[PDB]
Amino acid sequence: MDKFRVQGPTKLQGEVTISGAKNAALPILFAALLAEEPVEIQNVPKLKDVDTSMKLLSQLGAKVERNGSVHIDARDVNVFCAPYDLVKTMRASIWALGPLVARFGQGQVSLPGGCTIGARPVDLHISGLEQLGATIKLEEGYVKASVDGRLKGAHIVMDKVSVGATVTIMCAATLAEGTTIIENAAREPEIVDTANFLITLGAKISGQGTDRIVIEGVERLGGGVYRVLPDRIETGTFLVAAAISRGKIICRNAQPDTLDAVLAKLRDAGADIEVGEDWISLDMHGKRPKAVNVRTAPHPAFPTDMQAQFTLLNLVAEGTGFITETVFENRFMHVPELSRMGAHAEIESNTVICHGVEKLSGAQVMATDLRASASLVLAGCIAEGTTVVDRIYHIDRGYERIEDKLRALGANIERVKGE
């Protein structure tokens, strides 16, 4: 198994270019199955989950190719059976069941796996297809779906706000006849950036960032050109490593509108935050960060996608801070990893109690999650000791060349071969 070995402590001063998105680029690749015209996708980094979806669509019958820009022309798909080694690898592969019944007529999608983040809340993915006009049937795990004609339009009354429930209904109601109104939708920034891709094609969807969205049903659409916006998590992740080391970092190519409440709480703590359109500045002036008590909730007002990113910052601060997690109540793997370094914490019910210590010591940690893998690498740049991270194949799934971006900033990191 490949592992890293970051020494130090050093300093992190300089700039860094933000790459493409991850959670927003997955629904875009699945929306090309309904369009009969070649689309143009730009700003796509080389990731593990990105290269996995390329081989999945190639086995279905769609010839794909890329070199400087993504140009997927899915219109000659003939194979409907999907492999098992590709669906269980990721988690968002279940969203492809929508377009595989709207234009074609059949499809076999297995149960995905991905990283251990919960009990796989797939209850809203099945209920979102019966109200539109589908057949509930399956054989050997292959979720079959066959229905003559397009999907009907009816008002959907949801119960809870999920992550993949909004993407499943939105990607399966574009070409469907009838007006479908989604009640209590997800106002996360991944839905707003995805809705911009449908407007270029020809969809009539107005009202992004609202729990009630009126989706207009059309007949057929075409192609369009739209550049994928950079990821918002990658920009906020680099700001945590600079606040714990007392320095200054200048970001490039970011979206300040996607992180409204994220930078609002850090301003009252005593940090100069400069806004803009393409660059975001942040400086601590050598001061010590504070602790905030904000409950996790869908965007805005501190989204739930900033749990493991602000976990290390609350431990190195002062006082007593607690974060009530109501979305990922089962992803508590980043807490036992930091307790061995020399920290103390307690998880009560669904809220983690973060204390306030100074520095820690580097040791042997294990990264088995996606968001919990970045908090273990940045902690070794300021601690005193050798930091060994086990299973580093999750870092490449969302970040491309992480060891090269931190090398220019001031961090001795090298890759060690394993298997």
Binding site: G113, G118, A119, R120, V122, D123, N330, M333, V335, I347
Partner: protein, 419 residues
């Protein structure tokens, strides 16, 4: 090097025990799921079916090699084997059987087979204020509770040495030839003063004259085995006390993903610490050739008792003298268990069991009868080794120091018996 696990060369092809492996092992990384596939029998939505639906993945369990080779000394206990079991999560098989009979459409009777989930395991808990008073009372009441059992062993070993002194004088009467210092000892065992027989054979009155003496020495050899092995069993103070902690879990929607499953698993956290006492210069070397089992002690007691033997005429000088050579070898090995008693062991066990459980089950806000049976497959177990001790005022070194002088006085008497 022609060795399994836990062996190391020493002298002339003599195996030892490596200290850098049993106390500090090297854990590995395993990525293999227990039950990656399962079935869902029964009738759902008025349609009986039986397929093969898989589950989730990502199970990282780090285990340590379990070794049970040679101990640390002769007739001792097993060494502290580091047994670490840190699974990725808490997976438990649930063979549920949920069924509901309401109206005509909502009628199903499906049988869930092999259902597991992944949550969190708070392994960050200590009890450094409950196992310390338990060691003070055990050491303060040791002189009062066991104050009479230890005193019986001191008067037993000293009484056996008095019988060996009178037996040595009988062998010297054969070489010298004094008949006055031989017939008077036989009359001391009976009530009055009489002689059973009078002949010229020196070996005739030595066998029948020492018949009541052989019955008394044999009872001491059989009693010493019970008064010595029970003391070593009392050196295993592995007591502890833990508390209770419940684990909450929701968003469970298996099979058709229309019914909600939830409950409250009540775990049983345990934390105990063991302490042992052994010789500080006894676990250095270990040879299996000189290891004499307990069966050799019972054979020497019946050597002189024989209804028909020819040893009294086939060189009797090489039979009674050799008997004392085997007795000194046993006392020389048992004497090392009381010379310089230093605290060298000490293990800490921390495992989590499973008790009662109260699970429920609903379906879109409706009371549904639940009749399941939760099992237990993946648990939690930890076993490390320490090298420190808080309180160490009263020790067993001064008490066992008096037993060393008694054993050394008997070993020197057998060496002076010449032919």
């Amino acid at each position: 090097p022609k060795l399994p696990r836990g062996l190391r060369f020493g002298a002339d092809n003599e195996i030892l025990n490596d200290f850098q492996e049993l106390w500090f092992p090297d854990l590995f990384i395993e990525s293999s799921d227990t039950h990656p596939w399962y079935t869902l029998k029964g009738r759902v939505l008025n349609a009986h079916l039986d397929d093969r639906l898989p589950n989730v993945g990502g199970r990282q369990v780090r285990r340590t090699p379990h070794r049970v080779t040679v101990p640390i000394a002769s007739s001792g206990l097993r060494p502290v084997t580091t047994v670490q079991y840190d699974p990725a999560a808490l997976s438990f098989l649930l063979n549920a059987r949920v069924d509901w009979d309401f109206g005509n459409g909502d009628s199903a009777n499906l049988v869930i087979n092999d259902f597991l989930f992944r949550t969190f395991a708070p392994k960050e808990f200590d009890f450094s204020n409950s196992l310390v008073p338990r060691y003070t009372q055990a050491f303060s009441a040791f002189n009062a509770k066991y104050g009479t059992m230890i005193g019986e062993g001191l008067e037993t070993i000293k009484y056996l040495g008095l019988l060996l002194r009178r037996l040595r004088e009988g062998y010297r009467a054969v070489k010298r030839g004094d008949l006055r210092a031989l017939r008077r000892v036989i009359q001391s065992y009976h009530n009055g003063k009489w002689k059973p027989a009078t002949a010229g054979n020196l070996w005739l009155e030595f066998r029948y004259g020492l018949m009541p003496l052989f019955y008394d020495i044999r009872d001491v050899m059989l009693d010493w085995q019970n008064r010595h092995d029970k003391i070593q069993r009392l050196l295993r103070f592995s007591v502890g006390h833990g508390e209770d902690y419940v684990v909450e879990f929701d968003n469970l929607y298996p099979a058709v993903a229309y019914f909600k499953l939830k409950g409250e698993i009540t775990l049983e956290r345990r934390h105990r610490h063991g302490i042992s006492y052994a010789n500080r210069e006894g676990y250095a070397v270990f040879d299996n050739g000189s290891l004499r089992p307990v069966s050799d002690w019972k054979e020497l007691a019946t050597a002189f008792i024989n209804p028909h033997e020819v040893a009294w005429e086939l060189t009797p000088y090489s039979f009674v003298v050799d008997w004392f050579l085997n007795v000194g070898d046993i006392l020389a090995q048992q004497g090392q268990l009381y010379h310089n008693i230093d605290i060298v062991d000490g293990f800490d066990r921390r495992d989590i069991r499973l008790k009662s459980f109260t699970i429920k089950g609903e379906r879109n806000g409706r009371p549904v009868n639940v009749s399941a049976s939760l099992s237990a497959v993946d648990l939690f177990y930890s076993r490390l080794h320490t090298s420190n001790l808080p309180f160490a005022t009263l020790d067993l070194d001064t008490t066992f120091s008096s037993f060393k002088h008694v054993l050394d006085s008997i070993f020197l008497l057998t060496q002076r018996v010449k032919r």
